[PDB]
RNA sequence: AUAUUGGCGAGAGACCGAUAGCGAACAAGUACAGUGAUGGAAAGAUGAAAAGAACUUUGAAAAGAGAGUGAAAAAGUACGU
RNA sequence: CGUGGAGGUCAGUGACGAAGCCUAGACCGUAAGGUCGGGUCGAACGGCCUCUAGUGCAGAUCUUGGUGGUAGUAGCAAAUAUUCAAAUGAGAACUUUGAAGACUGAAGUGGGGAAAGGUUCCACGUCAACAGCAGUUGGACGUGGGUUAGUCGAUCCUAAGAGAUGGGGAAGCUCCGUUUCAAAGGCCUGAUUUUAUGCAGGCCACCAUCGAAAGGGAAUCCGGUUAAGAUUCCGGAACCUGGAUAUGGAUUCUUCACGGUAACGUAACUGAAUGUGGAGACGUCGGCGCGAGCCCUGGGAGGAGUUAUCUUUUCUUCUUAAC
RNA sequence: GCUUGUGACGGCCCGUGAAAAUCCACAGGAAGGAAUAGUUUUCAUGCCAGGUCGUACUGAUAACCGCAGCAGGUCUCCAAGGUGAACAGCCUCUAGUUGAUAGAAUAAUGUAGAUAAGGGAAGUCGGCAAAAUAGAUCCGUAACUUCGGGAUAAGGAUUGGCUCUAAGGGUCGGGUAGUGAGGGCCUUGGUCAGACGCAGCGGGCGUGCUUGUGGACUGCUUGGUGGGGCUUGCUCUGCUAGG
RNA sequence: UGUACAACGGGGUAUUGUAAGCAGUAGAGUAGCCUUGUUGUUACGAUCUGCUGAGAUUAAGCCUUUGUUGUCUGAUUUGU
């Protein structure tokens, strides 16, 4: 060990700059003479990972790791390994390697800052505080160190220490602040105010001191919105009402279009009990802002007189109908969610009286806007023929509006006509090809109309077309979600339709002379193969949204240092909250539920087709053999044609690169080994570790914990659901019946778990569900359910129909009851349930 | 008043044009061969101007694949056509 | 008909490109030849009437220069001889190191030299050309350093030889001769107190020069120090020549010494011209005596190796100069 | 036992087998000289200088010459141990090389060596080429002749290894008894050059290191505070310092 | 995947010729000596005899062998 270290030191400068081939050549020349060099292998792994290679880089890194016994080597190798782990989404190993390097003897304090970022990604703040303290004591000439120390002491719990540190820093640097460093300083001041907020509590002297400090720093703080908000909060936490009212009036003068400021002023003034005071206040404020909308929308929520309410509604709808806004119904969208038989008749009467005095030629714009508003109002009131008549009259009057076509497509979708709606919306979109919202709506409605190829062809227009025949790669690079969700649902519907198709084809079973279904089977086989391939592609596309969220969370590497260098601690806390709440999105929950349903269906049908029927030799023959008719050449030609078609299909639906993911066909995802383990270690642990209290889907947790052998979690979730959302829901009774049928000794599980669940049920719910009817086969649970919770619930009936194999409570009677109970709903939902859910 | 391929200083061609013209248009009594009196050559002009190759990659290099200079490098120093 | 050049003309053409080259492209002329078109390529060139020749191509075993069949054949066969492990690298039948196995079998394939080569010896880096294969190797390439004399030679003298003046012939470049019909030169004493070294005398005639770095010859070694020089440098000890000059010894009033019969001796113990003698100075063959070196061997003091069996065992060190 | 140098020698000649420079000696007698000192530096010591040019390497199947690193030509001193008359032929030590494109089959035909049953030159222009004979001692040895030769003529007999026998030399020595020198005198006793030199209690010359104690800076389980900003957790310049 | 084959070893058989090592009052005779002898012994001593009718090879172009050790798919080319 003499010349190899010199060559490594002379080649390290190539990696330090912007050189890769010259360093790789030197590493190869070194390894050609001695292959047992750990530093050279560790550098070559990172060099191959930084240029594009993945397999060779991982192999070299694994070899370098295996060629290490103790923790006593050069710190450069450990630093390179830490960089590699940081670049390969490995935080624990990177932290361990950096700690081992710093424990050996490194004179580079900046490495400590790296740890201050790494642990900042895993939440380990106990050692992060010490790392920040060391990195601050190492260099005393940058405000980023002070900001990082303040943030670390505020997040942990050292509030007084952070206040003292900020005070000492401001005393030492009083007057030595440049111009560009003023704003940041102001931001820091605001952050200190936030710290003082944590020292506010309910003490009078503390709040007075915070108010005095805020009034003293007001001439120095540049941010005025947050300053005035904190001032109003302090005034509300004390007792001064006039000063708080003045602050809120100043905020309104700064920005009148804000419902939050108006609500806070209403709460501060204490006039929420009397209606005349609020009426006079809003009538006086209307003269100050005649062009706003909250001052005219909020007073429509506490009116009791019918004549006054009608007059206010008329004065609110007259300017909107005169100027013509594409959101008039939106302006009354939330009110319709809270009022109905009391407000909607008066609004309809006013609109009819206004329309009876208009003219289709003198005032065409108010005429068409009144027609659109009437169509919206009737569509909201479950009316369809009159809405279609109004939209047809509007199209005949002025066929140059996209909103009319959008409303027609929405009505046709609500009436179960998806294809006609897609056709009308495409025809309307072809009128002007410059808007993207209408294109996205058309693609979504085509995906909802069992039309995927045309939807993709329409979407492949505004996308960047380079190394692909369509724009699927561009749609995946712009970070999409709704498109994938809407396309996977169409794939699932098309796959479920094939089940009914095969059932109808097998119901004949070659009845008498039925050679038509026997002589024609190649097309059916090709259609089934295509449907299976698209179903696999759907499962492949499902593995994207969680991966996208993981990539978004991992891309916060340089942000931990940027938020401290630029001086944005409040933005850092906001980013932390955003990263913690990432797993609380509705689209994420929907995608996770769909993935769970798919995995459970795959587990079920795999365990069903594993050991069933008989004669495997007569079933594993398939085709590719016509006896004495050249079977080898025929099978070879068939395989060649299938491969040639699959290559073109994969190039058409190309989304992921070939060097990044080889599972393009998706055959390995639909035939995995442990689906439940993968779903728990990839899709469930994150949602379990990052979740609130009231926002928690108990149905998905119950479905996940049912088929694993753990019933205590099921009982806890059921108890929490009954305590939160009450006990008068059909879902509670359905889950209780499912649990009672699962605790039967006939089902192969754990007798101890069944016994403890039975004891818990007998101890908790003793006068709700008969727990002594598990031995009688004549007791019908459907009658008891419809007597207690009733048959009007749809979610409970859907859950009982989904879990009917393990709970024998009938089938035909349940289906008839569901059909009879679905009638007071919308036709499209009824059709979808009868076609797929039933 | 006559002679003058040697030497210095000048003006010219119906003269050959570099395998010629004096042996030599260049490091031409140079190198080279012989102990000798002596014999005695071959070798021009890339490009207006080196501005003749910064830089990437392959290769241990030589050099190649580029890029680029440059009217034009089927003008790259073994170079007018 | 074609080419070099010149006079007149077409107010000729031409880098929006000529000359030249290629053209299983065409046209004209019986033919020597000319014209256009496509590519090359870049600087000047063509027709008409005449004039001026260093004016035409296939070989003259013609000259210069370049290139094929042979042919990737012939051939890389004497001096009895190579293998294994590590290092330098892209590359070890060929390099270096280690272990062997072998040659010269000491009138050596070794140490030093006279010719002869003239920086080829040595260090660093280096493989484009040389080492008829290969090569990171070299007496190859580029950059640098390296040759110390009183004791060696040299220098000088001379033999066999060459040769210049005085002279003799040749028109002459020059031939003979060189002590031969040549009145040819330096060398010691005395003068001194203008003499500085000239002169008043005794006198000797040798007769020019060059030429044998193994002929003769005034003078030394020891040990070590360099990537190369060692008898030259370093430390020590002597010898020869030349010129200065003092000390002591010896000699003397038997002024230039004694002893031994003798051959001769004792540390010095006046002295020139001239003459004489000796050294210098010398054949081969064969033996004898002596000395030195080489070689063998004993005692004794060390070091190395054997030891299935045995050997007071086999080898090596124990040296001394010039004076 | 080998090489070299030297001295007297024996034979050789109608070849009897070199100069000069330079030095030394003798004959000779010119000239000079004494001691109150004049000579003597061919006696020993004491002073200075000896100039100029060569100096490396090769001296050869690679450094010279043969158009090239070409089994060709080039002089001189040195050189061991064993067999062996021998400086030959063979093996080895000191010393110098491992370099002369390499490997595998290893068939014709060739280069360099041989083997060859019986006959034997009959082969060929010719036994030229091969092999024989051929190392040391002995017997024997013709014709001829210029009587010196022929003559190792021809022809043959022995010739290994171990252990023994006889022979060819030198250097030494020719008495007993009384005496002197035992010119070795050992030894017992000393006389006084019995010195030079072995070793120690030692002294000086500074000085080589520590236990136990007045002190010192940098530091810690840290007890307690001049001040500032937060007007509570808290922050900073810090400070008197108990141990 | 096999009474298949290869390298060793056991033999059959052949070439040469009685080894290595020890022992023997063997050994032509010679020295040291001591109780000096009716075999006196310590060493030198070419050789002779006893195991040796073994020892050296036994295969490259001889024969066999369930013994020992193993091997058993490295690439190219083909059509009326």
From Swiss-Prot:
Coiled coil start-end: 607-651
Main location: cytoplasm
TPR repeat residue numbers: 4-37, 38-71, 75-108, 110-146, 225-258, 368-401, 436-469, 712-745
Annotated positions of the Phosphoserine modification: 658
Cellular compartments per GO CC: cytoplasm; mitochondrion; NatA complex
Sample GO molecular function, one term: acetyltransferase activator activity
Compartment(s) where it occurs, according to its Swiss-Prot or TrEMBL record: Cytoplasm
A Pfam family: NatA_aux_su
Classification via InterPro entries: NatA_aux_su, TPR-like_helical_dom_sf, TPR_rpt
Note: Present with 7600 molecules/cell in log phase SD medium.
Primary role: Non-catalytic component of the NatA N-terminal acetyltransferase, which catalyzes acetylation of proteins beginning with Met-Ser, Met-Gly and Met-Ala. N-acetylation plays a role in normal eukaryotic translation and processing, protect against proteolytic degradation and protein turnover. NAT1 anchors ARD1 and NAT5 to the ribosome and may present the N termini of nascent polypeptides for acetylation.
Protein name: N-terminal acetyltransferase A complex subunit NAT1
Species lineage: Eukaryota, Fungi, Dikarya, Ascomycota, Saccharomycotina
Gene name as annotated: NAT1
